[PDB]
Amino acid sequence: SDKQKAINYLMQFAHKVSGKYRGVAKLEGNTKAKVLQVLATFAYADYCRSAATPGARCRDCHGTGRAVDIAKTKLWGRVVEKECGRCKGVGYSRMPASAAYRAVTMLIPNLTQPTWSRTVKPLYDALVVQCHKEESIADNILNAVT
């Protein structure tokens, strides 16, 4: 419901950016749709578990890997980010991705893990971090002093 809406939002984003990832960009339409749905479902679950589990994502950036660069934000008149110093940009554990790899191989049975790592997993990670970034923006808006 609320979960399915968020998953659908994430699936639509996955389609928008899919052309950047060589392992999904040229799949047949029906397979591409199934793959992107798997990636969005696993990525959203990975995000949700990491936010609710103590220690499962970085406690300074809350998963985004990024922090505000105060001086550059002032200079440029827009939010400029830098790497999160605490997690040096990792944001969230990468171990849950193995489950997504297994689910994708059921749809792409010749996809090896190193080919996944280079050509598909970057989209999975783009989706996980997209969720942490959405949460950070929602928090910034909710708590603005203006």
Which parts are annotated binding residues?
58, 61, 84, 87
- Helix 29-52 to helix 2-17 angle (10° resolution) is 130
Burial pattern 94-120, b for ≥16 Cβ within 10 A else e, equals eebbeebbeebeeebeebeeeebeeeb
Which one of Zn ion, Cl ion, a second copy, none interacts with residue 59, CB within 5 to 8 A by kind?
A: a second copy
Query: Which segments are annotated as binding site for Zn(2+)?
Result: 58, 61, 84, 87
Residue 58 C-beta: closest distance to Zn ion, Å: 3
- CB under 5 to 8 A by kind: which of a second copy, Zn ion, Cl ion, none does 61 bind? Zn ion
**DSSP, residue by residue, 33-89:** HHHHHHHHHHHHHHHHHHHHSTTSB-TTTTTSSEEE-HHHHHHHTS--EEE-TTTTT
Q: Is 126 in the site for Cl ion (CB under 5 A)?
A: no
Interface with a second copy, residue 25, by CB under 8 A = no
Q: Which does 105 bind (CB under 5 to 8 A by kind): Cl ion, Zn ion, a second copy, none?
A: a second copy
Interface of this chain with a second copy, residues 113 to 142, rule: CB under 8 A: 113-114, 135, 138-139, 142
Q: Which stretch binds a second copy (CB under 8 A): 18-26, 85-93, 106-114, 121-129?
A: 106-114
Q: At what angle do helices 121-142 and 97-105 cross, to 10 degrees?
A: 130
User: By CB under 5 A, is residue 39 in contact with Zn ion?
Assistant: no
In angstroms, the CA 50 to CA 58 distance is 9
CB-nearer residue toward a second copy: 29 or 54: 54
**Contact set for Zn ion, span 81-140 (CB under 5 A):** 84, 86-87
